[PDB]
């Protein structure tokens, strides 16, 4: 596959096969580069390329591992902003990546587990690097990620309404409420727990929500 | 010729990211003010662009 | 069939099958099937030209040791336990003295059959199977059992004089330790890698000498039943730890006279100072007592399953659990005779007693050899 | 409508008759929380009210409910044990 | 000396300053020959310097180094038996791996541990030789020879201290066994030192049940027989004479459920003690308090053993949790499935107390799902108030999709094909997409079947069926029985109970037949249709728009919807016609699916695959002959051929098939076979009675990462199909089939390999008792 060549002969073969995208071959170059020379001057950049190319060859855990390798190699680095984005950007793509999106199905009613991991690392990017090549856009990811969390948590908040668990209507919506007031998924959920209060005959407590409904009428 | 199944660069399939959450936060009246965002839901809101959205590659 | 019946093996048998002298048998009697493939420290007695032997299915017969024809016969068909008429299942060797056939059973129950008829003149259940042949000695039935115990039973009735745990292995690490009586000391090894003298009067540890390795955190011999029986010349205990690693050591104190604490010794006899042994590649080697000075070894037996080195009819006789018998010369000389009186294989040692060479194989049982 | 079969869905978080006797007007939250633990609904922005509302649907008509809200003061010292049945 | 400079010669992995800190000849430090030799050993104490050659040009120092790093590979040789990552688990635990720094002292040390691995495997005649193969720039390959002669095997158990219960009889209860009697075989057997431990607890249970409660196994002595295999065991026990469970004095925090507790402490005082029964009875309380909300039912039993009357006296000390532990529940592994579909499959409600088994019934609902690979969770107490145990239902979903094949060969025929692919649970939405169909020269057949299972949340299972069978059997024309048939049925699922569900739907069945076959019962249907169709030719056509109403019903308490082992599922399947139909009839049928586990591990389960049906007319009219029951082949009875089991049709004396290939496709036609004969395929009965009994069997020669998706199931098959309309009047000089004893029979085993598109089930089965018209294909290869 990739034998003991000159390291840049190992590298520039991959550097073309990055652009060629032959990551069946390029990654095996960048591996056998850093298998032999993880002490290469661009072996950090190989690790940057591996965080790149694993996320280009669907090795998103290995991307995370190469992130963790780059965490293990240099957890401070001027491309940790590239990394902590890519830590979220893997976890963004780790969150929801089915072909049902290509077949046109919602995945925000699906598990936002790595959304919250991307909600960490994108926010860890903008906390670690509030200035980066990725700080601005990943912030919109985050606000969208909690909206994805809103459309997720609403998806069961109506379920308790058809379950009829008006206790579990409220606390799920209240779970949305302690997490995001801004999302309309919370704000469409706003009269529902109030209605569920009226199912629990907490009309008066629902009036307190109707007070919100009065003052958040738009 | 040969088999065709591959994967390459892209960073944001949509800009639903950039089409982030609506802002219908508490304009609720007095006394009706419950807790609103918990943890990093209080998002560290800061900006550094580079290229944003779908525009910037990773290296 | 056997183009495909291949499996994983590793062995290489004896070379050098010779007969400078002629080997033969004294008789055959084939006393049942004794030990068998299921191992046991049942070892016969050839006392008074009476074959005091049995098979472990029960039938204990004294034999007229010329043709092995039955002097008496009894049966250890055990009528009880969870079963009536059980096999004898004997752990200890056939110790015979007086009106008593002392045999340790794997029922942990030792007998004394009256050697005029085989009637059990006493029987006593002991602590675990007799992992040694019963060293019935000085009023005491001294047995190293499975639980490392120093049994002493009043051999006239089996009244237990004491039973105390001793140098004791981690598991049933197979090997006897056969507590010998030497100068007021109950002298034993123990299948744990130490060697001792205990008080022969009461079972009070005179000394225990830790020597060298045993299994358990040290992978050593499980093809060498390492003799933890001390063969004590009057002041010097000669014994192996649990790995054949030989040491010579004082009797009253354990003080190391010398050691060949590197050995692979399966069986050993301190034949004066021609200490005949079995190597792990089954070389018979002659050491001395002033230091285990190799007088000779010889490689004429390789990867065998030998019996003990014995001298009978003037030659260093060795048999095996391949049923081969070999007459090494005593000193540095080779096969003087090779006998194939068996191939079922002798797990009993050559009994050079009453002028014969009594050997009970596993199932091709008791053979008596002359030359 | 005229549908008949019910799996008879339940919703707990109530207080037994033992439980409502465990507390009194004047008890802190904690005093209730030692006696009753927490409710599975408390007051989000108002004063401390500890809502133990039961819910259950038996059959076609009629709904079982046992609403037990424990309105404390702001100090948690209990001010109102609201005992309330179905409907 | 005080150094000018050290030349750091030989570096590859370790840095210069990383060397230099371990150099006590460093810049500023004085240089001594001891400090040089300390620079030898401390850089040996870096662990990555195979050599350290510290020297000097006065004080111009220079340190030459070879390196133990990168082990480029570890080569394993002779380990066909043992997987080498476990051998690497000996190696990778030992501070070395591919890329690492091999001290050549650790060659035998890992080899000892690798033999200690064998020693802890159960091998002892198994040695290992590690060969260092040094490679470029520092590197080494670790070739490992493996000298595996033999392992160990059990042979014997001596139980001393036992006098009552028989050892080999107990070995017939124990795990470590060895037997092939002349009326008994359980295969071949071996040793494990933890099968030791269960045999202790087999025995520990074996005395505890009887009352032996001062029973205690004293010690155990496994023979280290010097033969590298010989394992004999000396088991010191105290049998420990029996005790009566002579009274419960249950106490502690009984949580007010004491009368409920006393039922779970209902014993016979003076019955011989069984602590396992007590061990059962504690959990009953723990499920009692578990269903009483208390997820933490601390129960301590104390059987106060009274030897004076040979009894025990049962103290039980109870401590409940708290009731209202179910604050909420979480769900995980819903990353492709719709979440609330999984949330609706639970019965323990958030904001309640704990019904412990509603979770499990809720898990049973998910167990009854079948689009899972795991039904599990995280039962987590959320810390703080005694009202938050929040259950995080982590589950693994299953793959979907299924292909079925019916085409034989291409590239020598025209545009002719078979289709059919399933997308049941379409993309986590539940949408049961299963669609088939085919365009050939003999037919142009189509079929649709998709269910929205929860178009409304009641299990409102929007199962719309459609089909379009433009069936021709085109030989050169429409001659031999062409029917263009078309129609639909949308059927729906109804909540009857929590394991019961009904089905109903209206079936549109429009058929436009032509050139019908000259056999008797086909016309005898049409003669009882009121048609008077000519029998000596195929000169009749038939439009029929059957307006039918179909129905059904489900029982479901059986283990899994993809891989069940226990329970039963009963599935009603019926239909009826309405006024307005072109034929007033019905056809109702039913299938049975029960699972009887022989094994308590349920590795052997009797499967009852038996199916019934009957269909007839609704007055003045008849169930159509294409609705007759067939079998053979892909039925219960396999090794047969499909639709070869049942009644068989008599022809008429026949001339024109409406096209007669010359002694081909004979319909008793003018081309041969004149003067009515009788056909051999199953024209089928108006009754069905088929049966098969399948027996689950494990698969040993497969790496079981995918053998868990495999069920081998032996069976013996038997069935009968007959027509109560088959009247011995023209079927009098021919076989008459109004008799329920058409008892055709086979046996065999199935081949269930779950692919990524599911199981494709084959069978080499063989008929043994056959009746009229049974054709046999012993090699049945299906989905």
């Amino acid at each position: 596959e990739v034998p003991d060549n000159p390291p840049n002969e190992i590298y520039a073969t991959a550097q073309q096969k990055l652009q060629d995208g032959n990551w069946r071959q390029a990654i095996t170059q960048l591996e056998a580069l850093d298998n032999r020379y993880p002490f290469g001057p661009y072996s950090q950049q190989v690790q940057l390329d591996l965080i790149y190319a694993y996320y280009k060859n669907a090795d998103l855990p290995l991307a995370q591992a190469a992130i963790d390798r780059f965490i293990r190699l240099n957890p401070t680095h001027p491309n940790i902003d590239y990394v902590m984005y890519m830590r979220g950007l893997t976890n963004m793509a780790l969150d929801d990546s089915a072909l049902q999106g290509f077949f046109g199905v919602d995945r925000s009613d699906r598990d936002p587990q790595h959304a919250r991991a991307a909600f960490s690392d994108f926010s860890k990017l903008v906390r670690g690097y509030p200035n980066s090549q990725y700080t601005t856009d990943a912030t919109k990811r985050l606000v969208f990620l909690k909206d994805r969390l809103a459309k997720y948590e609403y998806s069961v908040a109506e379920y308790y309404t058809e379950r009829g668990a008006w206790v579990a209507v409220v606390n799920r919506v209240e779970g949305m409420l302690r997490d995001y007031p801004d999302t309309q998924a919370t704000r469409d959920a706003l009269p529902l727990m109030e209605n569920a209060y009226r199912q629990m005959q907490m009309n008066a407590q629902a009036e307190k929500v109707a007070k919100i409904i009065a003052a958040n009428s738009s | 010729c040969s088999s065709d199944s591959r994967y390459k660069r892209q960073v944001s399939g949509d800009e639903a990211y950039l089409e982030a959450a609506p802002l219908a936060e508490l304009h609720a009246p007095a006394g009706m003010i419950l807790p609103v965002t918990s943890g990093d839901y209080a998002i560290p809101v800061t900006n550094g662009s580079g290229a944003v959205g779908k525009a910037l590659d990773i290296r | 069939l056997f183009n495909s019946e291949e499996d994983v093996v590793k062995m290489s048998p004896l070379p050098t099958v010779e007969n400078q002298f002629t080997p033969t048998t004294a008789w055959s009697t084939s006393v049942g099937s004794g030990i068998g493939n299921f191992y046991s420290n049942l070892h016969p007695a050839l006392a008074d030209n009476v074959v005091y032997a049995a098979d472990r299915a029960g039938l204990v017969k004294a034999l007229n040791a010329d043709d092995g024809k039955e002097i008496w016969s009894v049966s250890l068909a055990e009528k009880d336990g969870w079963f009536s008429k059980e096999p004898a299942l004997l752990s200890g060797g056939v110790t015979v003295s007086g009106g008593h056939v002392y045999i340790g059973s794997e029922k942990a129950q030792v007998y004394a059959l009256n050697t005029s008829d085989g009637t059990v003149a006493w029987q006593t259940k002991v602590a675990g199977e007799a992992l040694s042949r019963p060293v019935v000695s000085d009023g005491l039935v001294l047995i190293h059992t499975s639980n490392g115990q120093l049994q002493a039973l009043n051999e006239a009735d089996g009244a237990v004089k004491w039973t105390v745990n001793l140098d004791m292995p981690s598991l049933s690490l197979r090997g006897e330790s056969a507590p010998t009586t030497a100068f007021g000391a109950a002298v034993v090894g123990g299948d744990n890698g130490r060697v001792s003298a205990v008080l022969m009067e009461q079972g009070q540890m005179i000394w225990q000498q830790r020597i060298s390795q045993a299994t358990g955190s040290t992978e050593i011999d499980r093809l060498s039943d390492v003799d933890t029986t001390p063969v004590v010349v009057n002041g010097v205990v000669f014994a192996l730890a649990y790995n054949g690693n030989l040491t010579a050591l004082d009797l009253r104190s354990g003080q190391i006279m010398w050691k060949r604490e590197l050995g692979s010794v399966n069986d050993f006899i301190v034949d004066g100072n021609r200490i005949y042994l079995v190597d792990q590649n089954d070389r018979v080697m002659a050491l001395t007592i002033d230091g285990g000075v190799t007088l000779w070894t010889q490689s004429d037996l390789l990867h065998r399953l030998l019996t003990s080195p014995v001298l009978y009819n003037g030659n260093l006789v060795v048999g095996d659990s391949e049923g081969y018998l070999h007459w090494i010369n005593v000193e540095d000389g080779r096969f003087v005779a090779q006998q194939k009186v068996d191939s079922s294989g002798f797990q009993t040692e050559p009994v050079a007693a009453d002028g014969k060479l009594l050997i009970q194989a596993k199932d091709g049982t008791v053979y008596s050899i002359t030359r | 409508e005229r549908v008949v079969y019910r799996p008879d869905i339940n919703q707990g978080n109530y207080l037994t008759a033992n439980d409502v006797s465990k507390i009194r007007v004047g008890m802190t939250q904690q005093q209730v929380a030692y006696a009753l633990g927490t409710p599975l609904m408390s007051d989000p922005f108002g004063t401390n009210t500890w809502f133990y509302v039961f819910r259950q649907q038996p059959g076609h008509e009629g709904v079982t409910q046992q609403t037990l809200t424990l309105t404390f003061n702001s100090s948690g010292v209990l001010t109102n044990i609201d005992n309330k049945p179905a409907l | 000396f005080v150094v000018k400079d050290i030349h750091f010669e030989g570096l590859q992995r370790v840095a210069v300053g990383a060397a230099l800190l371990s150099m006590p000849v460093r810049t500023g430090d004085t240089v001594n020959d001891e400090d040089i030799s300390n620079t030898i050993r401390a850089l040996f104490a870096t662990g990555n310097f195979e050599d350290v050659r510290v020297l000097r040009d006065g004080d111009t120092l220079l340190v030459q180094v070879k390196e133990r790093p990168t082990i480029a590979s570890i080569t394993f040789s002779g380990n066909k038996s043992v997987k080498d990552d476990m051998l690497k688990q000996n190696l990778e635990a030992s501070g070395v791996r591919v890329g690492e720094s091999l001290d050549r002292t650790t060659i035998a040390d890992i080899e000892k541990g690798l033999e200690d691995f064998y020693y802890s495997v159960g091998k002892y005649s198994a040695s290992v030789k590690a060969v260092v193969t040094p490679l470029p720039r520092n590197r080494v390959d670790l070739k490992l020879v493996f000298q595996e002669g033999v392992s160990a095997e059990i042979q014997q158990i001596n139980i001393v201290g036992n006098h009552a219960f028989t050892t080999d009889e107990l070995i017939s209860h124990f795990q470590l066994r060895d037997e092939v009697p002349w009326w008994n075989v359980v295969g071949d057997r071996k040793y494990q030192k933890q099968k030791l431990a269960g045999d202790l607890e087999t025995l520990r249970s074996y005395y505890l049940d009887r009352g032996y409660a001062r029973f205690n196994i004293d010690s155990t002595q496994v023979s280290l027989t010097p033969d590298k295999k010989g394992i004999y065991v000396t088991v010191n026990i105290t049998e420990g004479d029996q005790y009566k469970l002579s009274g419960v004095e249950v106490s502690g925090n009984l949580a007010g459920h004491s009368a409920e507790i006393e039922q779970l402490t209902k014993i016979e005082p003076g019955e011989l003690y069984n602590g396992t029964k007590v061990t059962k009875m504690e959990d009953d309380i723990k499920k009692l308090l578990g269903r009483y909300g208390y997820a933490y039912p601390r129960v301590q039993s104390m059987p106060e053993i009274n030897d004076a009357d040979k009894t025990v006296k049962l103290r039980v000390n109870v401590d409940a949790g708290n009731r209202f532990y179910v604050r909420k529940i979480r769900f995980e592994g819903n990353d492709t499935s719709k979440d609330a579909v999984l949330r609706r499959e639970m019965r323990q409600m958030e904001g309640a107390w704990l019904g412990s088994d509603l979770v499990d019934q809720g898990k049973e609902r998910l167990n009854r799902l079948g689009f899972f690979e795991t039904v599990d969770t995280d039962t987590q107490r959320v810390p703080g108030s005694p009202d938050q145990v929040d259950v995080v239902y982590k589950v693994k979903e299953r793959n979907t999709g299924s292909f079925n094949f019916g085409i034989g060969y291409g590239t020598e025929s025209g545009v002719s094909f078979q289709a059919g692919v399933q997308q049941d649970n379409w993309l986590g939405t539940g949408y049961a997409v299963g669609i088939n169909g085919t365009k050939n020269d003999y037919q142009t057949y189509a079929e649709l079947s998709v269910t929205n299972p929860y178009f409304t949340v009641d299990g409102v299972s929007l199962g719309g069926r459609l089909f379009y069978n433009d069936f021709q059997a085109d030989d050169a024309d429409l001659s031999d029985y062409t029917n263009k048939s078309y129609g639909t049925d949308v059927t729906l699922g109804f909540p009857i109970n929590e394991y019961n569900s009904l089905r109903a739907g209206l079936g549109y069945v429009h058929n436009s037949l032509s050139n019908m076959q000259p056999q008797v019962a086909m016309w005898r249907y049409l003669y009882s249709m009121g048609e008077h169709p000519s029998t000596s030719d195929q000169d009749n056509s038939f439009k029929t728009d059957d307006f039918t109403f179909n129905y059904g019903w489900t029982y479901n308490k059986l283990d899994r919807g993809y891989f069940p082992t226990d329970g039963s599922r009963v599935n009603l399947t019926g239909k009826v016609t309405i006024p307005g139909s072109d034929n007033e009839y019905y056809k109702v049928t039913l299938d049975t699916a029960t699972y009887v586990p022989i094994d308590d591990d349920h590795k052997w389960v009797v499967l009852g695959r038996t199916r019934w049906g009957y269909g007839d007319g609704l007055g003045g009219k008849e169930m159509p002959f294409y609705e007759n029951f067939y079998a053979g082949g892909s039925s219960t009875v396999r090794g047969f051929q499909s639709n070869t089991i049942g009644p068989k049709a008599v022809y008429f004396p026949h001339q024109a098939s409406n096209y007669d290939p010359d002694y081909d496709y004979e319909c008793a036609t003018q081309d041969g076979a004149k003067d009515l004969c009788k056909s051999d395929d199953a024209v089928g009965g108006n009754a069905m009675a088929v049966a098969s009994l399948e027996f689950i069997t494990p698969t040993p020669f497969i790496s079981d990462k995918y053998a868990n998706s495999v069920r081998t199931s032996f069976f013996w098959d038997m069935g009968t199909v007959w027509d109560t309309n088959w009247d011995s009047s023209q079927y009098s000089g021919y076989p008459d089939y109004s008799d329920p004893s058409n008892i055709r029979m086979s046996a065999g085993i199935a081949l269930q390999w779950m692919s990524p598109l599911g199981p494709l089930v084959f069978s080499y089965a063989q008929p043994f008792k056959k009746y009229d018209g049974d054709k046999a294909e012993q090699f049945q290869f299906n989905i």
Side-chain angles (χ1 to χ4, degrees), chain E residues 279-415:
Chain E
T279 320
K280 297 160 190 70
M281 279 189 306
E282 289 161 278
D283 325 332
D284 307 339
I285 304 158
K286 288 156 172 323
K287 297 175 296 282
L288 182 84
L289 299 195
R291 79 197 75 115
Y292 275 133
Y294 315 112
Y296 299 113
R298 196 277 312 153
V299 172
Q300 193 275 333
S301 156
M302 184 40 72
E304 321 147 354
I305 308 178
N306 190 5
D307 322 327
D309 52 354
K310 279 297 137 180
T311 60
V312 305
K313 268 80 179 167
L314 195 70
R315 173 63 50 176
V316 172
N317 303 122
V318 190
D319 157 74
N322 181 44
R323 293 210 59 95
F324 290 103
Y325 273 150
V326 184
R327 207 188 39 187
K328 275 173 159 190
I329 58 179
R330 304 317 166 287
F331 268 60
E332 281 300 307
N334 51 276
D335 203 86
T336 183
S337 158
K338 196 161 296 294
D339 51 355
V341 189
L342 324 164
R343 295 271 182 177
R344 83 196 47 174
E345 295 187 49
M346 302 303 302
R347 267 310 291 171
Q348 167 54 55
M349 57 304 290
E350 314 194 317
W353 70 97
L354 175 68
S356 45
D357 320 330
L358 320 173
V359 166
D360 319 337
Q361 167 54 43
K363 274 186 301 196
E364 203 270 346
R365 288 169 166 182
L366 306 155
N367 209 8
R368 276 182 306 171
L369 176 67
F371 278 95
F372 66 100
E373 288 152 33
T374 73
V375 170
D376 70 281
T377 178
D378 167 43
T379 81
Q380 196 39 251
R381 198 260 191 283
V382 167
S385 69
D387 297 302
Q388 30 182 13
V389 174
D390 277 9
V391 201
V392 182
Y393 290 90
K394 171 59 191 57
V395 289
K396 172 60 181 73
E397 81 291 340
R398 196 181 50 81
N399 191 6
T400 175
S402 158
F403 172 72
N404 50 5
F405 61 96
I407 193 181
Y409 198 38
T411 203
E412 279 92 5
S413 81
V415 182

Side-chain angles (χ1 to χ4, degrees), chain C residues 8-10 37-39 81-82 106-108 125 128-129 146-147 168 170-174 215-226 242, chain E residues 112 115-116 119 124 148-149 152 156 158-167 219-232 234 236:
Chain C
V8 294
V9 291
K10 180 179 161 56
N37 176 257
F38 174 47
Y39 280 68
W82 320 283
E106 307 156 358
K107 337 272 182 160
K125 165 118 187 175
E129 55 90 19
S146 44
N147 310 109
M168 187 184 167
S170 58
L171 305 161
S172 157
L173 275 49
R174 186 53 72 83
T215 67
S217 90
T218 303
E219 282 178 278
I220 59 112
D221 303 332
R222 208 168 90 95
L223 279 195
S224 176
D225 202 73
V226 165
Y242 196 38
Chain E
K112 168 68 179 286
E115 288 151 354
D116 271 327
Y119 191 75
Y124 196 44
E148 279 165 294
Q156 194 269 348
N158 181 16
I159 307 168
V160 287
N162 179 26
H163 48 275
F165 300 146
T166 316
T167 289
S219 71
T220 41
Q221 283 71 235
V222 41
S223 82
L224 272 81
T225 316
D227 44 0
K228 293 281 200 159
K229 176 154 293 310
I231 295 304
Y232 322 126
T234 305
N236 309 111

